[PDB]
Design a protein around this ligand. Sequence first.
Ligand SMILES: Nc1c(F)c(=O)[nH]c(=O)n1[C@@H]1O[C@H](COP(=O)(O)O)[C@@H](O)[C@H]1O
Ligand SMILES: Nc1c(F)c(=O)[nH]c(=O)n1[C@@H]1O[C@H](COP(=O)(O)O)[C@@H](O)[C@H]1O
Lengths: 214, 214
Amino acid sequence: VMNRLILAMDLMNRDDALRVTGEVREYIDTVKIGYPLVLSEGMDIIAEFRKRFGCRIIADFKVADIPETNEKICRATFKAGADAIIVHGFPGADSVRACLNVAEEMGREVFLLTEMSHPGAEMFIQGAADEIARMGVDLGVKNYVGPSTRPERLSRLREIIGQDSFLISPGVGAQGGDPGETLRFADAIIVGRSIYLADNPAAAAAGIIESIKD
Amino acid sequence: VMNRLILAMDLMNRDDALRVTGEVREYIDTVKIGYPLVLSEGMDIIAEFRKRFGCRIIADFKVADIPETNEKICRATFKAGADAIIVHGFPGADSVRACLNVAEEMGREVFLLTEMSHPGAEMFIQGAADEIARMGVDLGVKNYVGPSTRPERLSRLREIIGQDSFLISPGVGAQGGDPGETLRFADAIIVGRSIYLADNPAAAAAGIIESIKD
Ligand SMILES: Nc1c(F)c(=O)[nH]c(=O)n1[C@@H]1O[C@H](COP(=O)(O)O)[C@@H](O)[C@H]1O
Ligand SMILES: Nc1c(F)c(=O)[nH]c(=O)n1[C@@H]1O[C@H](COP(=O)(O)O)[C@@H](O)[C@H]1O
């Protein structure tokens, strides 16, 4: 991922999302698009971004349904041009394998979300997260998401998935995570508000990149 | 809910979804629309259904993000005209309260998903589900989802949320759940494929209603 930095583009109107993404494009290779933007502007926004910026797109849909519904969500998402989809592990192995099967059919990839970055993740997700990660390994998952806000958890998750797996990490900036500490364990960081709410998003991106080039 | 039966409309093209929903409308009051249909046809499908059928709409989005993202997803969903949204409890209390706050602002309702109906729910969700339900009660949640496929779990969940709470239950028909047994505990059942894949969806709906009128 260019500069190890993934933009979380959670602005909800197309003109602002296009402006900010264009402004920071010299600093990123990869944009995470989630439901805030997709439910406001439509699934066609994925192909628009992919074309206009020549960026890879991760669909952050935190897929969390039964296997049959997960299969449908994944097929619609890859049809729309997404390169990868984020899938929750908490609903269990059959729900994850349904997503992996569609990704295998469509030549796409699944990111398994293990532990989440927000405080409420401590209630139920954290206690299951090591086991969710192991389940991923056992299913052949190669791409994972884990929390910038808890680098000791991010270290453990790295220890389970091994060095060859690809690990991306949200919670940097607004939620309190640090770029450099997070990159001790993750391959790339995800950053939303610290960039997209900045008075100068390009300067904010450049500042983050500076802080991690060294 | 009319006849205690909620249609899970998971067909992915608008013409088929409109046909089947129109055919079974004399038997239902309430349609659950999820991401299979919304990601294929757009969020405008919610208002279209609400107008064309004069049905209530539950947006089955199994919201499962951090509080800030959950707030956005809920606002976009209620803006599109949904009456209610299904929210996962597994990400914890702050993520649920974010949805409750937007529902309170928009005059809408949240359904808390406790235990899911598919086999993989046994891995991580089932062991947390009683505690998820209690958390709902502690947050003032009045509407819940629990599994037709495990009526002993559905009985326990009813015992936690009490008799005044409203409980809906998927997993009837295709997944193995029984309409009448499920309605010992749930106020309404959710049915998808057993209706929408039937050669005659109206006859399938009518058959289910017959089996539970007695
Ligand atoms: N995908 C995520 C997770 F798995 C997770 O555990 N925590 C997250 O924040 N996100 C997303 O990452 C972004 C964080 O944005 P920012 O805080 O503004 O920098 C948002 O899109 C979140 O929905
Ligand atoms: N909302 C759900 C849950 F919380 C859950 O635990 N299990 C489910 O199946 N659904 C949804 O209920 C419907 C079940 O559809 P059918 O099997 O064809 O009858 C689908 O839309 C599922 O996504």
